[PDB]
């Protein structure tokens with residue numbers, strides 16, 4: 001219960017009501033600081049617990065794959081808080097006017113939410129702050145070290161962020177106190193109408209069969225843990241050597257759960273540190289879930305235009321500007337990129353994995369984004385196309401890891417300058433021939 005995990009969004013006078021947890025990013029009962037700190041606040045005020053979820057009007061911008069993944073985990077979530085005597089109230093509409101109305105109707109005393117450096121959360125936060133009179137608090141329940149505490153300034157590279165983050169690990173890498181149930185307390189239809197409005201935009205093939213295959217990742221808190229145990233037991237030892245081979249499913253497969261907050265990265269880090277495996281593989285994994293994941297929150301928190309060309313490092317901006325006018329080898333529209341109708345079969349195979357499974361392998365996710373920059377009229381058009389394709393079809397999309405990852409591939413964020421080349425400039429280059437010498441491309445293409 002470190003007080004450094006909490007910050008004040010609006011200082012006011014708490015009323016005689018239940019501490020209302022506005023769950024947005026961490027959709028889990030266990031291992032949730034915001035839920036834990038809300039319970040502590042409610043206990044110190046002799047007040048019950050309150051959990052509120054908002055079903056925003058922005059779910060039409062995504063597919064059924066994300067809607068069903070989040071909604072199915074909500075059903076498991078609701079029965080989980082019921083066992084803890086914690087009622088769950090789910091609202092549909094704008095968070096700005098629905099959270100404010102809820103606080104007035106239920107006479108809530110204190111409002112608490114989880115942290116999200118994305119632009120949408122800030123848009124919702126400003127609306128709620130202007131329509132409430134109760135104190136509003138926010139808890140960083142997604143990062144092992146709080147985003148504002150890891151660093152006070154945007155970090156240029158993982159070389160400069162790793163020593164800072166590991167310094168605060170002994171203070172902040174701790175276990176989760178048990179969630180105390182309430183002493184006393186006072187989706188199927190919603191899901192059905194959501195998919196009915198999302199059916200016309202569902203991805204279909206020539207024979208009109210659905211593209212998405214939903215058996216690859218079962219949503220829910222229970223399934224997220226089971227993926228964690230299987231990764232550690234069977235797929236952690238070989239992670240260091242085979243994490244760059246798409247043909248092998250050596251990855252943890254925890255990104256869809258981590259994005260929706262169905263499992264805490266802290267518990268994953270706690271479990272992998274206790275487990276015994278190859279030291280190189282262990283360090284490679286913590287380098288991904290701790291260093292590169294949390295720098296994404298740092299990148300989005302300290303860069304207002306994190307999804308724009310303005311957030312690129314100056315060496316990349318000058319290099320891309322000097323090679324703006326080079327004649328591109330090929331140009332592809334958004335529709336051509338979407339259907340996978342390019343001249344590169346590796347790119348087409350990666351896009352097919354994205355369309356079918358909803359989760360593209362991390363190694364090819366660097367090839368997939370960089371080739372978009374190669375075959376785009378401008379770097380800005382590459383950013384727009386990559387972001388749209390990422391957020392539309394990825395189960396882990398609309399996440400700070402996505403925008404930091406896209407900026408890494410296109411704008412060189414958290415990278416260094418490489419050999420100068422036409423069109424792409426000094427940005428890191430990955431070729432089809434290069435991938436052939438790293439992994440068997442043929443098996444990847446045939447699979448998808």
Ligand SMILES: Cc1cc2nc3c(=O)[nH]c(=O)nc-3n(C[C@H](O)[C@H](O)[C@H](O)COP(=O)(O)OP(=O)(O)OC[C@H]3O[C@@H](n4cnc5c(N)ncnc54)[C@H](O)[C@@H]3O)c2cc1C
Nearest residue numbers: 251252253254255288289292293362369396397401402405
């Ligand atoms: C262009 C591009 C876009 C991306 N968009 C997303 C996205 O929308 N959502 C998303 O969750 N990930 C994104 N990633 C980051 C990364 O690719 C994924 O986290 C990772 O591939 C997911 O696979 P995994 O977690 O099952 O396996 P693992 O390799 O074991 O990843 C474990 C965890 O480490 C983190 N991680 C791994 N690689 C990275 C990385 N390059 N940057 C930041 N964190 C990382 C992830 O949080 C991940 O959960 C993107 C990467 C790129 C290159």
